Coordinates of N, CA and C in Angstrom, one line a residue:
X1 N 144.6 -5.3 64.4 CA 143.5 -4.9 65.3 C 142.2 -4.8 64.6
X2 N 142.2 -4.7 63.3 CA 140.9 -4.7 62.5 C 140.3 -6.1 62.6
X3 N 141.1 -7.2 62.4 CA 140.5 -8.5 62.4 C 140.2 -8.9 63.8
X4 N 139.0 -9.5 64.0 CA 138.5 -10.0 65.3 C 139.4 -11.1 65.8
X5 N 139.6 -11.1 67.1 CA 140.5 -12.2 67.7 C 139.8 -13.5 67.6
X6 N 140.6 -14.6 67.5 CA 140.1 -15.9 67.4 C 140.4 -16.6 66.1
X7 N 140.8 -15.8 65.1 CA 141.0 -16.4 63.7 C 142.2 -15.6 63.1
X8 N 142.8 -16.3 62.1 CA 143.9 -15.7 61.3 C 143.6 -15.3 59.9
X9 N 142.7 -16.1 59.2 CA 142.4 -15.9 57.8 C 141.0 -15.2 57.8
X10 N 140.8 -14.4 56.8 CA 139.5 -13.7 56.6 C 139.2 -13.7 55.1
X11 N 138.1 -14.3 54.7 CA 137.7 -14.4 53.3 C 136.7 -13.3 53.1
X12 N 137.1 -12.4 52.2 CA 136.3 -11.2 51.8 C 136.2 -11.2 50.3
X13 N 134.9 -11.3 49.7 CA 134.7 -11.3 48.3 C 134.2 -10.0 47.9
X14 N 134.9 -9.3 47.0 CA 134.5 -7.9 46.5 C 134.4 -8.0 45.0
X15 N 133.4 -7.4 44.5 CA 133.2 -7.4 43.0 C 133.0 -5.9 42.6
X16 N 133.5 -5.7 41.4 CA 133.5 -4.4 40.7 C 132.8 -4.4 39.4
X17 N 132.1 -3.4 39.0 CA 131.4 -3.3 37.8 C 132.1 -2.3 36.9
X18 N 132.6 -2.8 35.7 CA 133.3 -2.0 34.8 C 132.4 -1.6 33.6
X19 N 132.4 -0.3 33.2 CA 131.6 0.2 32.1 C 132.5 0.5 30.9
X20 N 131.9 0.3 29.7 CA 132.8 0.6 28.5 C 133.2 2.0 28.3
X21 N 132.6 3.0 29.1 CA 133.0 4.4 28.9 C 134.4 4.6 29.5
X22 N 134.8 3.9 30.5 CA 136.1 4.0 31.1 C 137.0 2.9 30.5
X23 N 138.1 3.3 29.9 CA 139.0 2.4 29.2 C 140.4 2.3 29.9
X24 N 141.3 1.7 29.3 CA 142.7 1.6 29.8 C 142.7 0.9 31.2
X25 N 141.9 -0.2 31.4 CA 141.8 -0.9 32.6 C 143.0 -1.8 32.6
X26 N 143.8 -1.8 33.8 CA 145.0 -2.6 33.9 C 144.6 -4.0 34.4
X27 N 145.3 -5.0 33.9 CA 145.2 -6.4 34.2 C 143.7 -6.9 34.0
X28 N 142.9 -6.1 33.4 CA 141.5 -6.5 33.1 C 141.1 -5.9 31.8
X29 N 140.6 -6.7 30.9 CA 140.1 -6.2 29.6 C 138.8 -5.3 29.8
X30 N 138.6 -4.4 28.9 CA 137.5 -3.4 29.0 C 136.2 -4.1 28.7
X31 N 136.2 -5.2 28.0 CA 134.9 -5.9 27.7 C 134.2 -6.5 28.9
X32 N 135.0 -6.9 29.9 CA 134.4 -7.5 31.1 C 133.6 -6.5 31.9
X33 N 132.3 -6.7 32.0 CA 131.4 -5.8 32.7 C 131.6 -5.9 34.2
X34 N 131.7 -7.1 34.7 CA 131.9 -7.4 36.1 C 133.1 -8.3 36.3
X35 N 133.7 -8.1 37.5 CA 134.9 -8.9 37.9 C 134.7 -9.5 39.2
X36 N 135.4 -10.6 39.5 CA 135.3 -11.4 40.7 C 136.7 -11.3 41.4
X37 N 136.7 -10.7 42.6 CA 137.9 -10.6 43.4 C 137.7 -11.2 44.8
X38 N 138.5 -12.2 45.2 CA 138.4 -12.9 46.5 C 139.7 -12.6 47.2
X39 N 139.6 -11.5 48.0 CA 140.8 -11.1 48.8 C 140.9 -11.8 50.1
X40 N 142.1 -11.9 50.7 CA 142.3 -12.5 52.0 C 143.6 -11.9 52.6
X41 N 143.5 -11.6 53.9 CA 144.6 -11.0 54.6 C 144.8 -11.7 56.0
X42 N 146.0 -11.9 56.4 CA 146.3 -12.5 57.7 C 147.1 -11.5 58.6
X43 N 147.3 -11.9 59.8 CA 148.0 -11.0 60.8 C 149.5 -11.0 60.6
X44 N 150.0 -12.1 60.0 CA 151.5 -12.1 59.8 C 152.0 -11.2 58.8
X45 N 151.4 -11.3 57.6 CA 151.8 -10.4 56.5 C 151.2 -9.1 56.6
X46 N 151.9 -8.0 56.1 CA 151.4 -6.7 56.2 C 150.5 -6.4 54.9
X47 N 150.9 -6.9 53.8 CA 150.1 -6.7 52.6 C 149.0 -7.8 52.4
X48 N 148.0 -7.4 51.8 CA 146.8 -8.3 51.5 C 147.0 -9.0 50.2
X49 N 146.4 -10.2 50.2 CA 146.5 -11.1 49.1 C 145.2 -10.9 48.3
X50 N 145.3 -10.7 47.0 CA 144.2 -10.6 46.0 C 144.3 -11.5 44.9

């Protein structure tokens, strides 16, 4: 119900800024200041793809 009717795929690009003060980042090294995440979700699957 969140996705508007008429389409099945939804491209949403979300970015996060990581600072060296916070460590122990999972799947991402602490030296990377910014990250690029392009998530997409459809009506068939319940979980979202990242």
